[model samples]
Target: NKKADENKVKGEAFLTENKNKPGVVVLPSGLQYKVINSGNGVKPGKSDTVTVEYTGRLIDGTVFDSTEKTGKPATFQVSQVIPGWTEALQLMPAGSTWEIYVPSGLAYGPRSVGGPIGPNETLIFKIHLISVKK
Candidate 1:
């Protein structure tokens, strides 16, 4: 019931409100994260590899992707992911669970993965830092 790209406006407000929230941590890159289940494990660095569980959603709470497999989790280097994940994971300790609120550009950005996700769409994710090695 309004103009075009209302999602854009909604994203701006969402991020803004989240940024000021007490427990949520906002990085300079606009990657917002809050600890869900803190793990008494070591942290991963950019060059370090990790195994993490992912559940991604769009701005309006539409789930775009999730790791329902409950498998060994996805293992890869931190740099192998989108900007937000690349940055957020480094700060998260292995075995920790966190919810990250990623700005559009920090995620798929101008290029979308198709389906439920679109260009300039913000992404939210609940990630479990399953483990880290190497």
Candidate 2:
């Protein structure tokens, strides 16, 4: 319980500190993102699917997963992922790359994923929106 409480505080502090960074955009849903490379193509809708290259990391910068490491992009429906990712993809146009901060509430919450991502952990993702399809 103490670890879970600590995680909540850490996530909140990280988010608060991150918001003051230049270029960070805080969505009303509590996801924070910054465009790494802007895209000109069409943005995906909630019902649409997306092809993306992405890497997931913990707040301490430990990488958990990566398309770069796999050497191929992944495709999935916009609403099929975690809430923060779903929200981020809907706002991203094809060809854009973004760095996103996902609060635990929008990520895994109290559920731990694998070993590295613990309970109530905030997640960071570098996402490249390669393409979109309706």
Candidate 3:
């Protein structure tokens, strides 16, 4: 319980500090993102599947998963991932790259049976939207 509370505080503090950083934008949903490379293609819709190159990390800089290891992008439906990712993807156009900071409430939530990600942990992702398809 204490670990979860500590993590929650840490995540909140990190997010608050991050919001003031240059290039970062805070969405109404509380998702923090910075556009790395802008894309000209249309943003994907909720019903569409998107191909993307992404690396997921913890606030402590531990890499949980990455597309770079396979040297290939992954494809998944927009509504199929965590809420934070799903929301951000719909706002991101193909060929664009963004650095996203996700609050735990928008991710796996308070707990997830204690795996690579712990309770109340904030996640970071650098995502490159390769394409969008129906």
Point to the candidate with the largest TM-score.
3
* TM-score-better candidate, 1 vs 2: 2
Between candidates 2 and 3, the TM-score winner = 3
How well is each residue in 48-96 modelled by candidate 3, as lDDT tens digits?
9999999999888899999997967899999999999999999998899
lDDT of 1 by residue, 62-91 (tens): 887887676657777889888899999888
For candidate 3, report its TM-score. 0.96
Local distance difference test, each candidate:
0.83, 0.91, 0.93
TM per candidate: 0.88, 0.93, 0.96
- Output the worst ten-in-a-row residue range by lDDT, candidate 2: 109-118
**Residue pairs with backbone atoms closer than 3 Å in model 1 (clashes):** none
Q: What is the lDDT of residue 29 in candidate 1?
A: 83
Candidate numbers, best TM-score first, in rank order: 3, 2, 1
Give the higher-lDDT candidate: 2 or 3.
3
Q: In lDDT terms, which candidate is top? A: 3
lDDT of 1 at 112: 62
Q: Candidate 3 — what's its lDDT?
A: 0.93
Error (Å) of candidate 2 at residue 98 is: 0.4
